Point group: C3
Chain length 429, copies 3
DNA sequence: CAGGCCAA
DNA sequence: CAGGCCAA
DNA sequence: CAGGCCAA
């Protein structure tokens, strides 16, 4: 029989988009100096071990796509980031010929020059670390002497403005020529810092374990041999990275009296759970099903996360475990591996009189060429004849929310807990 | 060494039974007419799109096995339905030679004649549909003009009585000669209906998406070429279809003081959970472990579901996710695919003066031969020497119950929620 | 480029240890006699069917390793039992030449001599059984006439003292020469007992199912043909058998303000749950996530289980489902199969006048050579430069605890519930 | 040698 | 082209 | 023919 009709199904349009950027970064060869961080509120007193390995913010959307691209992508509901790849090439590493201390003849033609590469240090359960901006001494510009108050949000915002510049109506427009237009180098200021407990004021049983041997977890090469060579090549497939929420479905509550029905989930977990842990061991690990959350499209939608655009530079691209879909789903926790590259500090040719680390360093810069590609996909489903696009209600998305109404999102800024990136309340920009 | 004894284990007797029926169904080629359904209580105002695709009740036990077989199967505890298969063959489709409107000469030898087949429309998340009985206009017998109050339970009971007849003591015995004895055709009256929201009285943001293009999800063939041809051939393996509860185990509480003990389930879910969802998006999806339930055999058994025989025609055969077993079990939600077949309405040869759908249709009937087979299995375990059959306590079964004591069961009558059949309270017959 | 550094990671030292013992056991051919056990508190009145199959305590640590080895293993934190294997060889089985009843000439050269082997009877859901010590009649030394009050803890302690002897300062030192030094035979006194309900005082619907046919689940061989032959050869890989807790990690709460953070678990269960069941069917099976528990190392450690050394002879080696680790973990319930071996009772050559079981038995002993091997592994992780060994915080372990502070552990002493070994509160030694 | 721990 | 969503 | 049920 001639089939006059056949189940061709819905009309769905899938769009794949690619975002590419090229960035040139200058990195300081910061010395390895212990800095004291005083206790503040819930933060204990700790020792900080500074490094010269600059953080590469490849986990954020501004790294791959310009404000124009971001604004246009906003008009594509259902957009998911598919894969993010970054390639880092280092160029000739400059080392100061002399320290500038006139009282010594330390100038020399010879250089020992090492490049440090750190993949996934952020996820190591026992190396408590985060990326920090330092303040430096005037006599020794390469020696950290404290911490800048610049937060991670402010750092990434400043880096974005250096990448793309100001708006034409900005009075400060001339200050930052866009590196996306010029191709000029950008100074990085956000470096890996290793922390350990400070037991000087600790009462009771002190932990006196020193630092973890973090140099056993990084790669280091002779930077003289690495000129114009690829040093980092990492791809990442996103588990769940909703950049724009799905098209809202036609609400079945307007058609059906069964919208609030119940059905068996069996032994499968179709609702995600939040795990709370306590490294102080005052409380056992806790798993709580049905965390507070609300839809990011539909009649009672709360789109604060996507209207505050947390996902451009404040919050990492991948948010697996933060977002639920209303269907039989498998959801796991997610992390993007951290990338830190830098030059080891070059000691001065002075001769110190004691068996210890060098106390004076030559100025040295790492020159890193960064190639980054981001792939995204969006959908245009037509479940209904009129009224525009509508998705299936099984494509409805929820986002974890705090009880005060602030969206909860993954953050890569704080140190890991048991190798996990925490979920934290988003802050209104 | 000569083994005088070896672990031969228990004596268990497994019985496999087959139930076959042949039914001949007559289907009306109902027109596609929009019907208004006024809001009633929790049901909103909606538009109904009528079709001529008659529902095939292959998900119910009366479809395969007669009252005598059902009554005998009651005496086989531990009976599970294993597989249900249905084969549908269509015969010559009759179309009225003339409409009967004397004021027109619409009689014609020529016919355009189409058969519609719909598999799994009930499970489509975005096509809100259910099977309904219509009322028809007198001048146009093939045009629905409303809904009959006949419910799904009443419809399936009437169809069962048409299939098998009354008891010999019934005063109305002569009214329904059994089709199981005669082989005569039975008129089907339960047709697929597509629903959409009615926004005439809607206050606020209206959804004006019209209807979903449901004809993109059905098969249609020239019925003139389908004479004596198989059109539906579907098999279904039941995940969990307990027709008669297991043999009750010997209660360990009469032998042991450890009967109320606790043991680790680990990270496995050995207890099922009920998922509550809200398409109005007023409440997030909720998963609740340890839903109220009670045993269907044993000292505190509640056998209301199996004594009210919900499972004959009121409730579908498969109840996966409704029934728990006391052991390490994997349980998932279950659905039987819906089958709707019918003839598209044949327009009258009159010439209408406006660009629109036909307003008059010829009488047309689909002639469908239905072959159905049901396979069941039961067990006779002898854990003990005396007293009759007893099963292992790991074979104990629980059924979900509401707090008022009404058994909860799966139903295929209401429209799907996120592609799921709901669980609802059973009603006492 | 020449890599001056590469990620060699941590220094971790793994130590594998082997523990071997050889034991010679003498088993009585106890008669199959029904014993009444009166109701006591929560324990109902029941009938007990005695057997001669002696329990082999291969599930406990004292079976494989001496007090010196146990005390030294205490100084290896992070020790897990890996595998336990037992080989049982039976030697010539002695049968009394005569019963000693002078009023009969029952002495005979001829013997019918059978060896009974029972693997995994403890896990059978419908055979409610446990191992018991009997009291015997004076005229018939092989006939049980009651139960000794000796508990399982006391039995295993006495067997341990027979295996290894007393301390040199003990006044009772001469009473028990160590079998680990002498190689002498040890009399076993702990035999499989089959239970069934006693309905003499039962009010209401009585269960009169008799006994389960337990002889359909054991192996039996002609013991005359089994002289110097292997009869049991069983290996067991432990799922989780922590003998000494891990090295405590450096507490991140002393370094980080994020220690009490939350992260998504997704749909995975990273926290174990305890399943409570009710064979009386008064309560449905219940699964409870986040059972009370506390760490076995770290700042708030509760090491009562490992300081009371429950794991030497009071509690079985494997405790899977009792112990949690703070990470994405898969945990399941665990059981070690039971081993019971013995000689069937040899009837007297007297002629009884009634059709029934023999009422007099010859003395018979089983001679069983038991070879047992236990493999354990421990770790020495160095996450930090100073202060000694520290593990990753993902290696932190928690143990289930009751609300009163008593550690919860698996026990193989009580009869199974739905084929599961229960978790019970440990008792302070 | 990276992505929900590593000593798997 | 059906069975716990389909645009997987 | 044993290890989270066996009649899978």
């Amino acid at each position: 029989a001639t089939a006059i009709l056949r189940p061709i199904g819905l009309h769905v349009e899938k769009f794949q988009q690619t975002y590419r950027k090229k960035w040139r970064f200058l990195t300081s060869a910061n010395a390895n100096v212990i800095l004291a961080e005083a206790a503040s509120g819930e933060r204990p007193a700790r020792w900080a071990l500074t490094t010269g390995m600059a953080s590469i913010p490849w986990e954020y959307l501004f790294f791959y796509m310009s404000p124009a691209e971001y604004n246009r992508m906003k008009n594509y509901p259902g957009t998911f980031a598919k894969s993010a790849s970054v390639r880092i090439r280092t160029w000739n590493t400059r080392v100061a010929f002399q320290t500038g201390d006139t009282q010594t003849a330390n100038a020399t033609l010879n250089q020992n020059k090492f490049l440090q590469v750190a993949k996934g240090i952020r996820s190591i359960p026992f190396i408590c670390s985060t990326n920090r901006k330092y303040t430096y001494s005037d006599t020794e510009p390469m020696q950290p002497t404290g911490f800048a108050t610049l937060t991670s949000y402010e750092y990434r915002d400043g880096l974005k403005i250096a990448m793309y510049g100001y708006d034409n109506d900005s009075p400060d427009f001339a200050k930052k020529p866009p590196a996306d237009a010029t191709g000029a180098e950008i100074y990085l200021q956000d470096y890996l810092t290793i922390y350990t407990n400070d037991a000087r004021a600790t009462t009771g049983t002190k932990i006196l374990a020193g630092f973890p041997p973090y140099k056993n977890f990084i790669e280091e090469f002779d930077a003289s041999a690495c000129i114009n060579t690829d040093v980092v090549a990492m791809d990442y497939d996103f588990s769940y990275a909703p950049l724009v929420p799905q098209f809202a479905p036609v609400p079945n509550n307007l058609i059906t009296q069964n919208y609030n029905a119940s059905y068996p989930a069996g032994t499968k977990n179709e609702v995600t759970a939040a795990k709370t842990t306590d490294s102080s061991q005052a409380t056992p690990p806790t798993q709580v099903r049905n965390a507070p959350r609300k839809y990011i499209q539909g009649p009672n939608a709360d789109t604060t996360f996507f209207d505050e655009e947390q996902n451009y530079l404040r919050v990492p691209i991948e948010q697996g475990g933060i977002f639920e879909e209303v269907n039989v789903e498998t959801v796991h926790d997610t992390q993007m591996p951290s990338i830190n590259v830098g030059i080891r500090a070059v000691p001065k040719l002075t001769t110190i009189d004691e068996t210890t680390q060098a106390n004076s360093w030559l100025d040295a810069q790492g020159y890193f060429e960064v190639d980054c590609v981001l792939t995204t996909e969006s959908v245009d489903p037509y479940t209904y004849i009129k009224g525009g696009c509508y998705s299936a209600n099984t494509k409805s998305q929820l986002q974890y929310f705090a009880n005060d109404g602030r969206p909860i999102a993954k953050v890569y800024d704080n140190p890991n807990v048991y190798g996990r990136m925490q979920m934290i309340k988003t802050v209104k920009p």
